[PDB]
Every structure is written in C-alpha cells, then in structure tokens.
Write a protein that binds this ligand. Structure first.
Ligand SMILES: Cc1cc2nc3c(=O)[nH]c(=O)nc-3n(C[C@H](O)[C@H](O)[C@H](O)COP(=O)(O)OP(=O)(O)OC[C@H]3O[C@@H](n4cnc5c(N)ncnc54)[C@H](O)[C@@H]3O)c2cc1C
Ligand SMILES: Cc1cc2nc3c(=O)[nH]c(=O)nc-3n(C[C@H](O)[C@H](O)[C@H](O)COP(=O)(O)OP(=O)(O)OC[C@H]3O[C@@H](n4cnc5c(N)ncnc54)[C@H](O)[C@@H]3O)c2cc1C
Ligand SMILES: N[C@@H](Cc1c[nH]c2ccccc12)C(=O)O
Ligand SMILES: N[C@@H](Cc1c[nH]c2ccccc12)C(=O)O
Lengths: 414, 411
C-alpha cells in the first residue's frame, strides 16, 4: 500500500518523486516507486566498457543552451561534465559541404509545404535521387520516415550536435557526464530514498483498475512473483508505447492524440591500437552513407556508431544472425568509410551494443495544444514522459514533464 | 535464421543434448542452434561470488546417487570439496525419533503409498503428531498434496541433511570447489568448439510445424522478434515452460500429470564467523521456524534454504523490503540457536534467489526419460521426466534419451 505510486524510474519518474517529496503538501504521504528493470534510469544506461571507459548505451549528451533544467540538475547533484566533442564534421563529403546552403534554400518553402514528409519536401524541389543523397548525408534515418515532416526535420537537424551547423546553431555547446548519466540517476535516487520513497525494482506493471477512491495495481516480478499494490494517487512515468499493455485506454481516454516511435541502436568497440589517431579522427565524427551511418572516435579510447529507424532494425537483425557476422560487417563498413582496405581495419577487442525498440517517442504534429503531462479523464491517473513535450527524445523533456505531472498530482491532492 | 537442429534451453539438459549430438558422426557438419531466454547458460545452476563462491541453484551431488553427474565433473576437470551437511548434530527430540518412526511406517507404503505423505502419516499417527514429525525434516514439499508417501520417502532418502532417516547415510556428498557454473562453462565451451551457435536472451513463444520442419517464434529480451526455422527440435525446458507454449503439453506428450514447487535460498556474510562459538561450523540445523534449514559453511558464510509455502514466505518478505527481510532473518537465527537477537551481528552482505518453479516432477507408468510429441516429432527434455527429478543427474539422463531419440529421427 502507498498514498502515491509512481510507475517508472527513469529521469521523469525519479524527478516526479523528487518534486513531490520536496512539497509540504506531501508530508506524511507514503510514496512507492516501481520499475520493471533491476536498476533505475530507463533510457539512461551507463556502462563501463571492459574496464576501460564509461559509455552511454542510451542518453549521451546535453546542451546548456537547449537543456537548462538538465544543466541545473547536473550541478545540483554534483555531477562532473566534460566537453562533448562531436559538434562538427571535420571530414565533409561534397554533399555535406553543400548542406547548409541546400537547407537554407529550401527553408522559405516550409511556409507552403512544411507539413509534408521531409523526404517528399526535399524531393519536391530536388527530385528523388538528389533528395535521397542529401537527406542521407545527415546520418539520421528518421529524416526519411513518412511521419517526420519537413518542419520536424529542421527541428531535429538544429538540435543534434553533429549537424547543428546545418541550420546555423553552431553556438550551442555540448557536454557529457564524465562518469555517465547513471551518476545523476543515482544522485536523484539517493535523494528520494533519503526522503522516504520506497523502491520496488524488477516489477512490471500489468494492469490498473480503480477501486473506490484509489487504484489496484497488478504487477509481476522478473522472477515470477505476483504482487498487488493499492494506491491513492498514481503517476505512470512511462512512455506512450508502455501505456498500451495496460488497461487504461491509452490514448483515447487521455489526449486522443497520436504518438510516433522509432528505434535506436548503438554499438561500441574497443581496439588494441587507437588506430584512428593516424587519420586525425580522434574526437571526430564521420557521417557516412553506409549502414554504420554515424561513426564516432572518442579520444584514443574507443569508437562507436549510432543509428536509428530502419538502420537500427538493420543492426539488431545482424546481431540476431550472430556476433561474428555483426563484427565482420562493422569492419567492412569502417574500411569503406575510410577508403582503406579491409585488413587495415583491425579486429576489435571487447564490444557492446544496445537496441532500443522505442528509443524515441514523440507527439505527432498537431494544431491542438498538448500539455507536458496528461491526466486520465475519468480516473485522474497522471502520465509523465519526455514524449509529451517539445523536447521529446531529450532528457530535458522528462524534466519538463515531471514538473507538470507533479503539479497535477499536487492539485489533485489539494 | 535456420538450423538443422535446434535446442531451446541451455541448462545442463540442453547443453548435454548438444554435447551428445555434436559427438555423433551422424551430426558432422550439421548446423546446431541453442536458444535460452536468459543471458547466461545454466538454468537452475547459478553460481555467484558472495562479495566465497555460492550456489544460488543446484548445490551438491553424490557419487552414489549421481554417477552420470560425477562422471561429468571428472570429464571436465572440475574439482570437488566435501559437502559437510549430511547429518544433524543438534537433533531435536522429534528428529531423534525419525529413523524409527519412518522405519515403522515403511511396510505400509505397499497399502497406502499413493496417498499424500501428510495423509499417510496422519492415518497412523494422527494429524498433530504427523505435522510435528513431517515438519522436523525441513522440506515443506512433504506437506503437499501432490507429493505421495512413496515420493516423500524417495525425497527423504536422496537429500543429504536427512538421508540418515532412511539408512542412506552411506551416500557421500560433494560441492564444486569453483562452483557448478564452471561445469556449465566447460560444457558450453566444448559444444561451441564443436560448432554449436548460441542465441541467449531469446524466449521461445510458439512453434508450428512448417511442412518438413518447424518454425519457431521468439522474442529477444529487448523486444526484438525473431522467427527461426529448424528440421529437428529439442525443447530442453521444464514442464511449466512447456505448458506455456502452443504444443498441447502434457496431453500430446504423455498425459502424465506434473507438479512444481518454489525454492528460496538466502546467503549472508559477516565480520566474524560468530557461529564458531556454538561449534556450528559445517553443521546444518533443521528448525520449525521460517528459516527451516540453516547451514553454516566452515568459517565463511551461512545460508538458509526453504521450499514450497516457506519459499513463498521469504519471497513476500523480500517484496516488503530489505530491512524487514534482514531483521526477520536475524530474529529466526536467534530462535533457532536459543539465544538473544542482540548476539547476532548484522551481515556485511547477502544475496538471495527465489525460484518460482525450483523443482518440477511427475506426480504419477513407463514414463520415458524424454518425451516426443505424438504428431510433430518434437522432443522434450527435462530432469522432471526422470527418476531423478529435481537433480542434475536427471537432466543428464533425459539428455541421453533426448539425443538418442533425435539421432533416431535423423536416421
Ligand atoms: C540511444 C538513445 C540515445 C539518447 N540520446 C540522448 C541524448 O544524447 N541526450 C538526451 O537528452 N536524451 C537522449 N536520449 C533520450 C533520453 O534517454 C530520454 O528523453 C529520457 O531518458 C526519457 O526519460 P523518461 O523517464 O521519460 O522515460 P524512460 O527513461 O523510458 O523511463 C521509463 C521507465 O519506465 C519503466 N516501465 C515502462 N513500462 C513499465 C511497466 N509496465 N512496469 C514497470 N516499469 C515500466 C521502464 O523500465 C523505464 O525505466 C536518448 C535515448 C536513447 C534510447
Ligand atoms: C534452489 C535449487 C537447489 C537445487 N539443488 C540441487 C542440488 O543440490 N543438486 C542437484 O543435483 N540438483 C539441484 N537442483 C536441481 C537442478 O538445478 C535441476 O535438476 C537442473 O539444473 C535442471 O536442468 P535442466 O537443464 O533440465 O533445466 P533448467 O536448468 O531449468 O534449464 C531450462 C532452461 O530453459 C530456459 N527456458 C525455459 N523456457 C524457455 C523458453 N520459452 N524459451 C527459451 N528458453 C527457455 C530457461 O531459461 C533455462 O535456462 C536445485 C535446483 C534449485 C532451483
Ligand atoms: N536526442 C537523442 C534522441 C533523438 C531525438 N530525436 C531523434 C530523431 C532521430 C534519432 C534520434 C533522436 C539523441 O541525441 O540521439
Ligand atoms: N534436489 C534439490 C531440489 C529438490 C528435489 N526435490 C525436492 C523437494 C523439496 C525441496 C527441494 C527439492 C535439492 O537438493 O535441494
């Protein structure tokens, strides 16, 4: 039993708990937090790669200019930042050299045709083949999706560090966590534990039913243990996709809005030799047409690649087919990317990867205002997610959603 | 995604099927795929370093009961240590009487041995005495209605802490020096070297025949959906898992009835082996309180081991939270020893594992050691199908027969 229950211990749920426990109105209300994983953090997942480097399987970078709440959170929890270097393309293709002009040329036509898919928009003016070549040169395959509009594309381009120069956003600075954003999650978790929150990690919420004034939750432990939990006030700090399992009629009983999703994949590789130093690639990113798409060389420590949408599914299928083939593909694509023979790319030492079936979730384009958090029209359950915000796909959005979700719960309590 | 042979389940059963099959000339060069829903092989064998290596799952074997298992340890160069928990040094008055009382009941297994163990003992001793006597053996499965009297004597005679009650105290016991995970690693390494490919982290959801072959639907632990085509399939999973698939288990396979019960272990370490003061090093106490069987391993750690309704008890306790869980343990340790709680220190670290289907078994028949689906030819492999249900030996026996059956399909 609890007075307040939050399901989801990513940055959104944890920040809800933090706001609530900071409020005098929550004094003497017990708070229980559930998550289906054994550790908090959600799509923030730091890992030490073979004892050599702390890497981010999920969220990896932030900008003080774009993400002031997150900057403040990092400072509040005494977390060390370091410069994030991948904010320009040192080695542009001929296509990439023309991107800023190509995008600028098209931008006045957003007024007339900006709601259509970015692919169709670019094709309207350049034709299919040219559009394909131009779009692909930015490294984010979401830009090819029918449900990513030209408007949304210019927003994506302007907010991602590697290609922010394309829309003249070079001034935004970027940082990463020296020892991983999991440290921020741990900091928040320690604060809310100290204030009396109780954590029940490794339980998946299966269903919710009202029952008198409150709610009865059915959960399952990752070891099979079934648990029923009664609460008076409920925040579901989970993404839109997660809202479906449950029997809460999402989204029709909430916004009636539509939500998009796309998958993400990151693969990190260590090597015996920091072989890329010789090609002056340390702390640089290459954006390529081949399936690696965006290739990052971190100092002299490791490299990684990052894909989305169709290409994230491509990679996860390759992983399913076997480790040997997956590594061989990476080696082949590294060689093509650099213009050197395959045998001149070494075999790797230790490597790790992560596929996120719903890595990014977001509000589809609408003329109808969408609040930062939602409420179930009959039961008053609150929904909290980065996806509900203008910062969907960024930690800042979760912090924004959590402020509003806490606000709504506090109004329910009052 | 395809194979000649597919094994689902990388516990000791499935891994041993792969080993047998890859050893056979008939499987030279065949493509063999092994799936498991977990990210590491071993199943109910799970070793861990307790901040000493400990066994969260299977923990002991006997050369006398378990010749196939002993032979595997010997074959894979796995070293053993003496398992000291084979007698009760601090017997209660009821425990002192167990051997005589079980002796007296034994002839009556001919007449009423298919009744539950509780009903069988109650028939002759009355409910209260029966309860007191059955409880003193420390295995709460002995109270279950699915456990016959004949099954209960088999259980009592095969468990090291109580084997003396049925005059089996000649049977010797060992643990793995480096953990049974080393044996699993050994087997995995041998089958990988022989060309087996592993897909760990995938849950088999369903199967259909696909003319000549089988089409499996699997899901990755990260949500990725995978279909796999194979020509020969072994489901090396327990009956509970089989019943979750769409393969009409148990009706199309044996029509026998299977049971299951949960297990729980909890391990604790401390700043001193405080139990050395009570001469408890390398002893086991069997008590009426919820800990039930309490083990003190040399001067290194202690652990407790419960089953059936008491495993559920502890798992609920964990769900309520770590503080209450650990204070419950401290309280029950004091009561078992007959000392004040203050004399028991707080632990430095602890770990626990609940297994919702820790033991699966055939209730009761010429039950073969591995099963075939009557129409589809899919083969089922589990310790539960054998006369050593709930022991690694049983998995090795089932694997022998599963491999034999599959090699028969192949020819
Ligand atoms: C590869 C990748 C890269 C990223 N890059 C960046 C970046 O560089 N910068 C940036 O700012 N952001 C980045 N993001 C986004 C950032 O990760 C998200 O905006 C943010 O972490 C979302 O937080 P959240 O708490 O709303 O949701 P989540 O982090 O998804 O947390 C939701 C939680 O709910 C739990 N849950 C769901 N359903 C249930 C259920 N039924 N029962 C119990 N628990 C449940 C989940 O286990 C999860 O822990 C990235 C994300 C990914 C995947
Ligand atoms: C607490 C405990 C103590 C024990 N003590 C001992 C002992 O001291 N001595 C002894 O000999 N034995 C002991 N055992 C028993 C022993 O562990 C089992 O007899 C043996 O490990 C069973 O092996 P198996 O391969 O048949 O089954 P399992 O080890 O259960 O292996 C089955 C595998 O199938 C996988 N799986 C199941 N369903 C699916 C699916 N749908 N898709 C994909 N994968 C699937 C599971 O992940 C699992 O890895 C103990 C067991 C427990 C739980
Ligand atoms: N902002 C995250 C995720 C993200 C938001 N929108 C996206 C569109 C495509 C791919 C990823 C994203 C990143 O830096 O990666
Ligand atoms: N043989 C295993 C498990 C086991 C088999 N049958 C049982 C009945 C009850 C409890 C445990 C068991 C052990 O040593 O623990």
């Amino acid at each position: 039993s609890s007075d307040i229950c939050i399901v989801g211990a990513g940055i959104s749920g944890l920040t809800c708990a933090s706001h609530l426990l900071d409020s005098p109105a929550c004094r003497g209300l017990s708070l229980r937090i559930f998550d289906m994983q054994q550790e908090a953090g959600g799509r923030i997942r730091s890992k030490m790669l073979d004892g050599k480097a702390s890497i981010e399987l999920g969220a990896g970078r932030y900008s003080p200019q774009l993400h002031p709440h997150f900057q403040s959170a990092m400072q509040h929890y005494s977390q060390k930042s370091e410069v994030y270097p991948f904010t320009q393309l040192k080695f542009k293709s001929h296509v990439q050299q023309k991107l800023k002009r190509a995008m600028n040329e098209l931008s006045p036509r957003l007024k007339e045709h900006g709601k259509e898919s970015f692919l169709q928009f670019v094709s309207r003016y350049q034709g299919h083949d040219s559009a394909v070549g131009m779009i692909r040169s930015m490294g984010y395959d979401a830009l090819f999706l029918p449900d990513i509009s030209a408007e949304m594309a210019y927003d994506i381009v302007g907010k991602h560090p590697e290609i922010q120069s394309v829309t003249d956003n070079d001034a935004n600075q970027w940082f990463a966590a020296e020892t991983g954003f999991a440290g921020l999650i741990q900091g928040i978790k320690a604060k809310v534990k100290a204030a009396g929150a109780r954590f029940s990690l490794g339980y998946r919420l299966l269903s919710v039913r009202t029952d008198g004034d409150g709610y009865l939750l059915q959960l399952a432990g990752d070891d099979g243990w079934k648990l029923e939990h009664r609460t008076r006030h409920l925040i579901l700090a989970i993404p839109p996709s997660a809202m479906a399992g449950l029997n809460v009629d999402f989204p029709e009983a909430w916004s009636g809005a539509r939500y998009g999703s796309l998958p993400l994949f990151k693969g990190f590789l260590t090597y015996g030799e920091p072989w890329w130093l010789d090609y002056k690639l340390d702390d640089q990113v290459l954006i390529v047409d081949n399936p690696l798409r965006k290739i990052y060389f971190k100092g002299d420590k490791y490299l990684f690649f990052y894909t989305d949408s169709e290409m994230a599914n491509y990679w996860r299928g390759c992983v399913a087919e076997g480790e040997d083939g997956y590594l061989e593909q990476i080696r082949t694509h590294l060689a093509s990317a650099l213009g050197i023979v395959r045998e001149r790319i070494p075999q790797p030492l230790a490597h790790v990867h992560k596929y996120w079936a719903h890595g990014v979730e977001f509000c589809r384009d609408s003329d109808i205002d969408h609040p930062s958090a939602l409420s179930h029209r009959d039961s008053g359950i609150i929904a909290c997610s980065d996806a509900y915000t203008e910062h969907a796909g960024w930690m800042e959005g979760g912090l924004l959603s959590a402020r509003e979700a806490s606000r709504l719960l506090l109004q329910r309590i009052a």
